[PDB]
Amino acid sequence: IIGGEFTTIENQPWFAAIYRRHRGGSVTYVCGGSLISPCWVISATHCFIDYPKKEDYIVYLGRSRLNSNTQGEMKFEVENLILHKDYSADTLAYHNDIALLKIRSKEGRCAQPSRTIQTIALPSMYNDPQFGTSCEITGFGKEQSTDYLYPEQLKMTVVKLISHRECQQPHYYGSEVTTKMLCAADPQWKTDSCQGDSGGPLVCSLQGRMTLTGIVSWGRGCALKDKPGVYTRVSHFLPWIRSHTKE
């Protein structure tokens, strides 16, 4: 997260922290995600495409720090890792960048809401809010494009949805932003998601409800003039989602 503020899990209690264990025993952070029902976390397919064995993954909920423990956090295994069949990584962008993880604790439970863990509602199919609406993003991603390290504390910031027409402008992204994606950026280009915020939530208030409107997918640089963050347009994937969530 470029700019924005350090925060704690309580202000984003749907936020999931996804890690991978390597051959040694060493565990490193992979991507963000979002709790959309007690047993289900939603993220981005590109997070997993290189190492698709579900066994290697761990999901934390209730977690406000990257490499240390938070009071109230809960650790989960991944019982099903569902990548999107039409996923693809182009030369600049990703397509159908959406993934689902069914989480199970070693003791067989799905997540239990607490002060630090809550679900985030999905939108209605094809229902997205107005362009210029202010939304929230969250993650453990870099605080600057050029950084080598990641912040230890969770951050969040606010960005505004951008029109497709604006988005498809050549000095923006031109052709590469499709209707299954959303753009969002800072009006002065000072705040953004960055490397390591991938898979994370874009949350917007729709009707009166806080809703998961996007999933962090790609952007050129971070907080870079005329290059918005790009997100997977969740409202377009309710059939894909509901098919797998009904088990």
Partner: peptide
């Protein structure tokens, strides 16, 4: 790895 990925792995 697309040129504009925001993935840790890229």
């Amino acid at each position: 790895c697309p040129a504009y990925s925001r993935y840790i792995g890229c």
